[PDB]
């Protein structure tokens, strides 16, 4: 029992860990921020973010996966769980200023858990991650 | 194809409500979220409450916001917004406007307006 | 995460490369947008995600911006571009009247 994991094209990446599905995708657009939204600092935050429990523990297993270092690592953005726009939690892994020494960090997580991914972040300029839950794909298989 | 209507409403004495539709047609109406925006002639726009598509009602503009409500019936395909206590300072034209999601995987809340009503003068004098 | 447009008004000639910043309080990268609103007549959505302009919204249009600062630039506006412009997110900018050079 150890949550599968889908590659695609190149920008369409994709994971199921019990009922929930997701799709991971980098690009500049915005749609979390703070004051507005939540912030994640340790797992038990991400807890607050949805209902499901198979939604909350493969967040959580990812970022795990990843590297995110819940005491060093930046905390991330999430959407409030009582909120009917779905399910969505952002982090930030821009190639450039702060987050540099972290988005490089989160650039290799993905060359070990999906293999090969050449990167749509651009070094050294705003990039962010995005997971929404999205149905398990046709040519995913399992 | 998208086109937005409103009801009507004109002279109201100032603490008595007065309440506002707006019809929808063309465009999905039950996924595109719906909103209204305040209009006095002298200052331009301003936003005045917002409502998620398919219920879950969200908050409004604080500049006015604890006195009055806005609804959404899907079934009739119709906006509201029942304005009550009044003020004279909401002498204005009030619009419907509309938009959800960004062309990629983007969904969650957008104060963009890409469709827009004709707004209904609503002067608040007694 | 309150708006500030400027200039005023700006009075400018058709042909001239005219620009218009935006400011915000709260560090807002990609949820601004601009509007176009002739008196008379609600406002058009112009640009949306301060970058990406509106499907069906002429090329002389360009907005720039990401962080806190905003710009929207007309590289040769025509006489169908006069009018008052405001910025977007949950707050709202003032309006920059743009009037003609005579």
């Known amino acids: 029992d150890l949550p599968l994991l889908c590659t695609l094209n190149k920008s369409h990446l994709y994971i199921k860990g019990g009922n929930a599905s997701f799709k991971i995708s980098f690009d500049d657009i915005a749609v979390l921020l703070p004051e507005y939204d939540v912030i994640i600092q340790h797992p038990a935050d991400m807890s607050w973010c949805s209902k499901s429990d198979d939604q909350i523990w493969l967040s959580q297993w990812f970022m795990n996966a990843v590297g995110h270092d819940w005491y060093l690592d930046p905390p991330f953005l999430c959407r409030n769980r009582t909120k009917t726009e779905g399910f969505i939690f952002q982090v930030n892994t821009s190639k450039t200023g702060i987050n540099e020494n972290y988005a490089k960090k989160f650039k290799t997580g993905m060359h070990h858990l999906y293999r090969e991914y050449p990167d749509s972040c651009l070094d050294g300029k705003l990039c962010l991650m995005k997971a929404q839950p999205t149905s398990w794909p046709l040519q995913c298989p399992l | 194809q998208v086109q937005l209507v409103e009801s009507g409403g004109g002279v109201v004495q100032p603490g008595r409500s007065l309440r506002l539709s707006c019809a929808a047609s063309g465009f999905t109406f039950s996924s595109s979220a719906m909103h209204w925006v305040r209009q006095a002639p002298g200052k331009g726009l301003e936003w005045v409450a917002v409502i998620w598509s398919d219920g879950s009602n969200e908050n409004y503009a604080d500049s006015v916001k604890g006195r009055f409500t806005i609804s959404r019936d899907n079934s009739k395909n119709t906006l509201y917004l029942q304005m009550s206590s009044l003020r004279a300072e909401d002498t204005a034209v009030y619009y419907c406007?509309?938009?959800?999601?960004?062309?990629?995987?983007?969904?969650?809340?957008?104060?963009?307006?890409?469709?827009w009503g004709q707004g209904t003068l609503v002067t608040v004098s007694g | 995460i309150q708006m500030t447009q400027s200039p005023s008004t700006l009075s400018a000639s058709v042909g001239d490369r005219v620009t218009i910043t935006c400011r915000a309080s709260?560090?807002?990268?990609?949820?601004l947008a601009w509007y176009q609103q002739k008196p008379g007549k609600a406002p058009k959505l112009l640009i949306y995600?301060?970058?990406r302009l509106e499907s069906g919204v002429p090329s002389r249009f360009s907005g720039s911006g990401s962080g806190t600062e905003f710009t929207l630039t007309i590289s040769s506006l025509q006489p169908d571009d006069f009018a008052t412009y405001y910025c977007?997110?949950?707050?709202f900018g003032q309006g920059t009247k743009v009037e003609i050079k005579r």
């Open positions: 406007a509309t938009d959800k999601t960004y062309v990629s995987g983007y969904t969650s809340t957008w104060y963009y307006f890409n469709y």
């Open positions: 995600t301060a970058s």
């Open positions: 977007q997110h949950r707050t």
């Open positions: 709260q560090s807002i990268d990609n949820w």
